[PDB]
Amino acid sequence: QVDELLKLTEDQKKKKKEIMEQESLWKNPDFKGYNKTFQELHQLSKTFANNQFRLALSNYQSGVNTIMKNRDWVEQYRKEEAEKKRLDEKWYWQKVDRKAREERVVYREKMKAKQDALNYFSKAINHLDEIKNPDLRERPEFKRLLSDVYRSWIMAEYDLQNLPQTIPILELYIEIDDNEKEYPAHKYLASAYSFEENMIKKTKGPDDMLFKYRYKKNVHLLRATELKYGKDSPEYKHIVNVINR
Template identity: 30%
Template sequence: MKLYFLFVILFLFHPLFSESSSGEKKIEILIPDGNSGDNNGWGKNPLQFEDIDFLGDAGEENSKSFFDKSKEGYLNAVDRFRKATDLAETKRKDFDQRTFEADRYEWQKRNRRENFENSLTRDINKARSDSVRLLVASMNFLERIQNQKIRDSDHFRELQAGIYREYIKHQLAFRNYMQAMDLLERYIQIGSKYYEDSEAQGYLATCYERIYRLSKKTRDNQARDKYDVLRKKHGLLYAEFKFGKDSSDYKEFSRELFRD
């Protein structure tokens, strides 16, 4: 097995969650942390939207208003969460540079660090929750758009996909796999461009994997069989769109996947 592909396999089956039994293969993609620097929409930079003049000529001013409100909410959600993460990083750097004379023992230093990190986690989680509320409001504005010319436009689909991506990333970070799964299923139905998004297929396979494992524990055989098929189907789609169906990496991935 090539070293590159060995890395891919280790990445995909990384043991993120301790409740699974040892030796079980998993279809889990690491949750994005916003630092990947990718340009496919799943990384740190949000979509950039220009003013869409043609919407005013589409025949329904209310639809244009709803679109603008949805866009504003999306950009606000991204901006607020980014500011929260930037602030947390600034606080962490400041903490690392400080010395605390009261901490004479290692256990005191560890406790102070743990308390500090827990405080940052609470701040980030609150920012995530605030962002999710804004994104849900943005989704609702999109749903209220009735003008079909607007709904069929690339601008509409790009905004919808951007909102979904941000919402999905937050739900994955919260480990809310059912909510993430629901939006991922909608995301890949927006159009062929989004169906062929390898990251989306990988995250969807991750969600199906989690539900599959849960159904095994609860002995829900019907759900287990359903999500066993779905996790493998979308795991293969991830590999197909990531590597190409005729690639050696795809074939090796397939063999590893069906050993589970």
């Protein structure tokens, strides 16, 4: 129920704006977001003036471009196939079979794009790992790019339901700056643990595994709730009751 469970004063108005800005950033790339992100990242690169950061930004951009181009390819492919006349398609089962072939073509292409995008994201990380000076690693420019690469990586895996793969990345992401205080990161961590708990329940797996994943799901479901609604709110009191009863 992780997915379903998520939906003034000067401080509350400031909080609503921040949560919306965070939520906007945790989605598949679109043009408005792409334009804003790379305009910002390129001026941070100018202020940083670091060759390894330059190379990490180039790889990150290439990765986002891979994803964006593929998303257009899918919309175009779907359109082309819908517009074709099928004179030798008389039966219900034939259209079902055809649609299934088309969806496998799409899935194969989305898969390929994600793989290539993650290779660019992982290369971006490799370049940031080359920045050894601790003073440079503490820079806001460094932490911003690092967070953007991991978030894009999480979302790419999430899009194709590779929820287990997201867990180590989300864990690396929440270690950066004050990322642990971002409700979206806890929401996606709770979702991935929930997926594993459901897999154990379905495969009739060992109870020790079931309870482990249920607990970790609840840890992050509770933290996410606390972060966006606040402790002692009707939503936090409710999540405590679902865990208890």
